[PDB]
Amino acid sequence: LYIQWL
Amino acid sequence: LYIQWL
Amino acid sequence: LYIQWL
Amino acid sequence: LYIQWL
Amino acid sequence: LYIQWL
Amino acid sequence: LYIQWL
Amino acid sequence: LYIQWL
Amino acid sequence: LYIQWL
Amino acid sequence: LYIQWL
Amino acid sequence: LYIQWL
């Protein structure tokens, strides 16, 4: 699981 | 699962 | 599952 | 599943 | 399943 | 671009 | 770009 | 870019 | 970039 | 960048 959130 | 969210 | 959301 | 959403 | 939505 | 090979 | 190989 | 190999 | 190898 | 090898 990879989450990139901005 | 890959989530890229901006 | 790949989600790209802007 | 691939979702590209803008 | 591929969804491209703008 | 979405590539699925079975 | 999403690549899935089975 | 998401790469999954089985 | 996410790389998963099985 | 996330790399997972099995």
Residue numbers in the entry:
A (entry chain A), B (entry chain A), C (entry chain A), D (entry chain A), E (entry chain A), F (entry chain B), ...: 1 to 6
Quoted from the paper:
Aggregation-prone-motifs (APRs) of proteins are short segments, which – as isolated peptides - form diverse amyloid-like crystals. We introduce two APRs - designed variants of the incretin mimetic Exendin-4 - that both display crystal-phase polymorphism. Crystallographic and spectroscopic analysis revealed that a single amino-acid substitution can greatly reduce topological variability: while LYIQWL can form both parallel and anti-parallel β-sheets, LYIQNL selects only the former. We found that a simple change in crystallization temperature or modest changes of chemical composition of the solvent system (therefore the available interaction partners) can prompt formation of significantly different nanostructures: we identified four different polymorphs of the LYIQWL and two of the LYIQNL APR peptides.
We previously characterized the APR of the Tc5b miniprotein – LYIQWL –, and found that it is able to form polymorphic amyloid crystal structures with both parallel and antiparallel β-sheets. To study the potential interference of TFA, we have lyophilized the peptide in HCl, and crystallized it again from 10 v/v% ethanol. Interestingly, crystals grown at 37 °C (in the absence of TFA) consisted of parallel β-sheets. In this case a simple temperature change lead to an anti-parallel/parallel switch: starting solutions of completely identical chemical composition resulted in amyloid-like crystalline phases of entirely different topology. On the other hand, in crystals from the present work, grown from a solution containing less ethanol and no residual TFA, neighbouring β-sheets run parallel to each other, resulting in two larger class 4 and two smaller class 1 interfaces leading to an overall class 4 topology. The hydrophobic residues (Leu1, Ile3, Trp5) form clusters in both structures, while hydrogen bonds are formed by chain termini, solvent molecules, Tyr2, Gln4 and Trp5 of chain A in the class 4 structure. A common structural feature in the two parallel LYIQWL structures is the presence of a weak Tyr – Tyr interaction. The geometric parameters characterising this interaction are similar in the two structures: the distance between the centres of the aromatic rings are 5.6 Å and 6.1 Å in the class 1 and class 4 structures, respectively, while the angle between the planes of the rings are 81.9° and 86.7°. In contrast to the class 1 structure, the class 4 structure did not contain ethanol molecules – only a water molecule could be identified in the electron density map. This suggests that the presence of an increased amount of ethanol is able to induce an anti-parallel to parallel reorientation of β-sheets, even without forming direct ethanol-peptide contacts within the amyloid nanostructure.
